[PDB]
Amino acid sequence: GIDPFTIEPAWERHLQDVTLKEGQTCTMTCQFSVPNVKSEWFRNGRVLKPQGRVKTEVEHKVHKLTIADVRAEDQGQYTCKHEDLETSAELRIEKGELRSGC
């Protein structure tokens, strides 16, 4: 038959909800079944532009999102979208001193 060497597009590993304290560098990944394709990144409904803190990378299947020196302003939700297929994770900056248990 026709062996799909071009792996049919799918969201195998969805975006993962990463939580880290400010100052840390983050790199959230999403495994898109299609090798070496690009996707629009979104942060809280906005097109995520790789400026300053933000860096966007793409591997074979997985798409990576880097935030160096993360801020609570860069938190909430990230969404990786490729035309139809989309994915999302809650990025939380780890943070509150009064966490009800020092």
The CATH number of domain 11-93, selected from 3.90.1580.10, 2.60.40.10, 3.90.600.10, 2.30.33.40: 2.60.40.10
Q: Residue 100 gets which letter from DSSP?
A: S
DSSP 69: S
At 20 the three-state DSSP class reads strand
> β-pairing, 62-67 with 54-58?
antiparallel
Answer whether 21's CB lies under 8 Å from 95's CB: yes
By CB atoms closer than 10 A (0-12, 13-18, 19+), residue 91 is: buried
How was it solved? NMR
CB 76 within 8 A of CB 2: no
Sequence ranges of the domains in the chain: 11-93
72 three-state secondary structure: helix
List, as one string, the DSSP characters of the chain: ----SSPPP-EEE-----EE-TT--EEEEEEESSTT---EEEETTEE----TTEEEEE-SSEEEEEESS--GGG-S-EEEEETTEEEEE--EE---S--S--
State whether residue 74 is helix, strand or coil.
Answer: helix
